[PDB]
Amino acid sequence: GLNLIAAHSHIRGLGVDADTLEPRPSSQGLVGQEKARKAAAVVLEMIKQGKIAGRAVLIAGPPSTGKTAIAMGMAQSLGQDVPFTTLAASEIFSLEMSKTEALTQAFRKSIGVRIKEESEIMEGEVVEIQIDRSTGGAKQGKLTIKTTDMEAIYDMGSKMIDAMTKERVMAGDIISIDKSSGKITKLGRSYARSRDYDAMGVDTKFLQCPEGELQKRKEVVHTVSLHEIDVINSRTQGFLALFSGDTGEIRSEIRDQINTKVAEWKEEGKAEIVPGVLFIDEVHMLDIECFSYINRALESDLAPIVIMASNRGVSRIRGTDYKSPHGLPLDFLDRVVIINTHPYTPDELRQILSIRAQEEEVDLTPDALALLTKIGQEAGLRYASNLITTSQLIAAKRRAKQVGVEDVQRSFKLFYDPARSVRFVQESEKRLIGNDGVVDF
Amino acid sequence: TNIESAPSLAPMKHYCDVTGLPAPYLDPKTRLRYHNKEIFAMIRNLPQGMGEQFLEARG
């Protein structure tokens, strides 16, 4: 259920030590890359510090050398505390709004405000409800509830009886009367009144009575970004915009006033600022109009740390015509700090394929693993990592248990690696449409 | 003469009658305001003839 095995469902953190920053070679999924993972550990430990601006670290390297892997490791090694925001750099070129403002919203989404305030809630099974609607109305009524320990009677206001017939609280429900507002979230049904429920399904879950006292205070901790507050303070009822994207050009005085009130909340001790992480995946897909704004959005106090990944070598910059390293302008490459990765040695290829095999729970003979490492030496990680999933199913065709050489050699036979596909294009020129000609036999 | 005593009509803050701490909820069996589950335990296992004396001290 919504945990289908993706291409990065085996990474459970960055995997490095947190005491001497040593990249131990096989832990939490990330296996083999040493120097880049130590530099990512240093960057990760200066994100959680908070006493640095929005800086820019560029994960440069060849294709399929573990850059999104390092980014997903840093995403998993923070939890749901410091806001990590992914950004493939083609979500910016929108039509609902401009392009620089679409970039500004992605900067504002990664600066959380974390505030902690209390509520007063009530657990418990309702023993019975009596409502004096006799022509009468919702005027007075009695509510007898209990936990395993407590038991109590309350009298109800009119704007609570109008909330009891709103949720239809029965005799046996497990409700949570939030006292400061009045909403009722029925946590379930009590088991002991299983006879007393007729208009339910045949298969219906039942809980037990809540344990402990019946009137307790919760210290809930909320964390919302500055883009949240910007979209909330933009219309009459405007938070729906951040669930439907219908926000437009937000005027800059609203963002300036919210940048003032967050500082006034911090100095009064009512709030706390958490700088997040913004991962601009495929940063070479930005034109120079983006870099002339990222060069100045990484200057203010309220700026998240930007981590970004580039594949291209000496390539052209979009918008302009002149080439540059990594597809980035040089006045912006002065800002960034570059981590270079390396291709993988064959034993590291073998154990990455071993981790990808143990993630999908596919049994492999060591001869088939040697053949698969031999394929991955010549066709990359993605092809062999797909041959695993293909070979399990081909072994399941003929009712086998373990995959072998006779199934990896079928998966290598049917599904071409891209080198043989380029050879197929080069040796089938006259029928494939190059630019002009179609020849039919 | 001697009928100048006057009652009140206002919401009263109801306290506990076992201890003196502020208590927000009562009982169906004995109708005693009580603070927490220790006082609820001592209410539900007290010897008979005293659960009326708490209401007698309260009124």
Ligand SMILES: Nc1ncnc2c1ncn2[C@@H]1O[C@H](COP(=O)(O)OP(=O)(O)O)[C@@H](O)[C@H]1O
């Ligand atoms: N250190 C590693 N440990 C485990 N798997 C890795 C590692 N590096 C790369 N991989 C695997 O190789 C594949 C390619 O990595 P990825 O970062 O997506 O390539 P690219 O950098 O071209 O995006 C990923 O699916 C990932 O599972």
